[model samples]
Target: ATVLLEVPFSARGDRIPDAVAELRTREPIRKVRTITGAEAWLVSSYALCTQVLEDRRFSMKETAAAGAPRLNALTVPPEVVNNMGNIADAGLRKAVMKAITPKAPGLEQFLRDTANSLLDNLITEGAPADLRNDFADPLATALHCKVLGIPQEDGPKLFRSLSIAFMSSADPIPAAKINWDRDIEYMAGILENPNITTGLMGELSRLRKDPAYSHVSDELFATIGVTFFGAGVISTGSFLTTALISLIQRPQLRNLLHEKPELIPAGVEELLRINLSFADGLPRLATADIQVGDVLVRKGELVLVLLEGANFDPEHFPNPGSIELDRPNPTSHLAFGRGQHFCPGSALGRRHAQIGIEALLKKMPGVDLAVPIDQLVWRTRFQRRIPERLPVLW
Candidate 1:
């Protein structure tokens, strides 16, 4: 199975492939060929996945090291692999983290307001709604714009960049670079425009001009805006859309939350636990030979830490497929990932989904799929496992 099976057992977010559980049990750390034809180890069990992620010797940046065995041709430039380090080295990390926190004054209220308004319009329109495009994506797009301090009107144009921006491929994607540069230019323009003085971009613009930060490159400044906005929107939208399917399919749990709204944070935690969001396993390049589970992964090897491998393992989560809100280790799942480079905007992501789910349950308790489950089309050869369209009825 390791030789013949290409990683990412299936693209369907509605159901994880049964092969995952079988592999976790039989070959917790096994070799598999990536789309790029490079051989790599796929770490499946909970303990091994956690071990690889927490160990610094497994490098995320070196995944881009020239001629290193690649899992996929990077959609971003080689330099962008070190994007997080760049941001930290430039002394912008503090300002950037503070700006994106969900705790910022009025941010939660802003989220609630925006979520309800989006739901309000859909309710007015009638019975069937395409939640992916009209509701989920739009709400994600809107939240990122507000978080970035860019005008809400400007979000659609920036969002159009993500379809290519987020692609995972065996070869370089030409259009990916095209849209990246265009989005970078847009962010650069935002830095200079006197009126754009409010959100993350505004703060970055100020930092760029400061004497202490005078050495920072303009490319880094604009890159932060481009990457943050793009990543945030893509992640939040895809998760919420898939999470909706999870909720709608489980009426018993949805009703529980509807009756006792206080349980939603916990419900969202469980949703995060089980959501099949990340399409490919997270990748790291081994800097030194290391023992992982039963395998001795050699130096300069690519190791993919499968989130589902850890999340779904019976060792870590008994009855892993079912969403049980009362589980003790509920938030321990590696949904946001672990160790270095864990998602910086995790708080904001949770709030966006929580608020979005809260609104949907309140406004449309009858919400269910408008078409057969198999009819929904899932995007393929992309970063996240998301539906092309999620049509539903209230």
Candidate 2:
């Protein structure tokens, strides 16, 4: 219990690996009290984490059905919880999969164009720019907008609303609920027009009307669109921001990749794994008794799978702390997650990472941190991982 208070439990605060390492070494499957004053089980081993991830015994919906083992407010329904297949409807997932796959082909070009445009704007404004604002944030928002048929005009506003909804602790739930409702309303308005057939919203709309997929409702479709926007925008932006920071920290790697553009893709994977953003793992509550490692977890118990720790587990990945650009089994990392609940937008996400890094590296071979690393403010919270401002210069 004391350990939970000692270590920051949320993503926006401190990253998970340092806390997880201490927990795993000290107590692999230990009982700890969360920030919200709930007793929960924290699982930090790679084998156990994935075992729970792949296991059918645990129920994601039950967490929300009853309540999630909390540290602060409940940010999302247990079913919408990342990396858990339990709460989300399979049909909605199928619809999303169908929509995302076909849109993949153009993503590389999309990233290149978006990144260059943002970089150009950053330069026009001045030498130093808020990487999150000038580059990562906008590019990520645009990518989500392009994929979901959300209008560019509404992009900034929608993004601001979503940010407040997730980040605000002052009645965060009500703020989030309002933003979500508005997002659904906005998506519904967009879907009303018959000519919209390009993005995920269009596909959802089509699927909802189709005889073969009548299982999906209009409300569900709109919810999915809003959900997609929330999931994609900030996370991708944070990743790009972090990737840029990692490169800045180690200029040698940036130069290496700049010389060999082909190395960009692999570098993206390595950095994603090494940086381990979104510091929290998918929180799951045991629906039935479950065994993880040597411990027996009871029903209704809250479990936290430390993603960053699992990704960096010495047993799963040798020399886990170091980043090997060409790490042989690069895809083995759990960044997009593992098993049935693996991210539906993985291909698109990878393309974004690939293109964002490639374009940034090409444009600025000498990009370095504008402020000292110690001076930059790393965000601390339950829902996101990123620096409030990542200032950079070439």
Candidate 3:
């Protein structure tokens, strides 16, 4: 394993693209030491990236069975970690799945209305708008909150705390820990409330009572709430902001899609491929001595699969860097990842991006950069890619 620099990998935004580029070219699958000085394999090709993501040999449930691999030992408990994977039981998975399944039928239309409603607010107010704070961030937070049955007023507050905890480098752990604790308490309160209105949490509560869903526990319900709020709110917000930036940068493409409304969905497929939201990948410890390609990974060694770098590999998509709205193999891209660990929220994420973009383009067809391209802010954090602010005008 080659030792890389000591700067926290999650905190260094400037180094990521270059590091990913270098890894893709020089050492497609090689061990590199992280900021925490932990050695891990870095996988940066499309084929290899999916191989690791899809292969059952790599388990998200590792934390439960053998303990999780972490540069800094995870402060969160094993139940929280295992719940994130949600790979433990088919029945437990179905509890939350049933809640979302009913909602899924109306998702596209609901998202369209939600996106347009936000745009109306953005447009009616007009000019010098910070999409991250005013539009994108709020939109995502509100959606998740509504789904989880959290009070809308509480949604923004939680988002502020969680966003700061996740994105800020200055003593983020304390805040992150505090926010998680508060969030869990809040979910617990909701679960115990008989009058709690319908939302994901309510659905979970109902499921837990059913003879078939007796396997669902309070902790399990809390886990689903925590993961959904975090993933849906933060990642979706960031992806929307980033995808908007991509469209703005290439006005020709934006205009083409806007003119042909039917093309937006196809365009979104390409958008997901191009956007780098979360870290390239999470670390997976090799359960046994595994050889991938020509690289030999020793047993119990930590490894990372770079998601964006691999999705953008030319081998998978011809002219990968160039966003082609109608890319033939968009589904082949490893954006939502693969296999059991493939993001269950992927369908919602895609709908959010697609609807948000459509609403922006339809409502403000002439929207343009309200500031210089270089002035645009990019999120510099380990957990997710976010725009600090996106100012635009029509």
Number of the top lDDT candidate? 1
* Clashes per candidate (backbone, < 3 Å): 0, 6, 1
What are the per-residue Cα lDDT tens digits for candidate 2 across 134-204? 78888888888888765777788778875664562423377776777787788888778786777787777
Residue 50 local lDDT, model 3: 79
Q: Pick the candidate with the highest TM-score.
A: 1
Screening candidate 3 with a backbone cut-off below 3 angstroms (N, C-alpha, C), the clashing residue pairs are 10-382
In model 3, the worst 10-residue window by lDDT is 6-15
Q: Which sequence of candidate numbers ranks them by lDDT, best first?
A: 1, 2, 3
TM-score of 3: 0.89
The regions of model 1 sitting more than 4 angstroms off are 1-3
**Which 10-residue span in candidate 1 carries the lowest summed lDDT?**
1-10
* Candidate 2 lDDT (Cα, 0 to 1): 0.71
Distance from true location, Cα of 124 in model 1, Å: 1.3
Question: Tens digits of per-residue lDDT for model 1 on 195-260?
Answer: 988889989988888999999999999999999998999999999999999999999999999999
User: Comparing candidate 2 with candidate 3, which one achieves the higher lDDT?
Assistant: 2
- lDDT of candidate 3 over 72-176, digit per residue (tens): 444355556566455246265655655443255565676677778888888778797777788778778877877777677888767876665454342226657
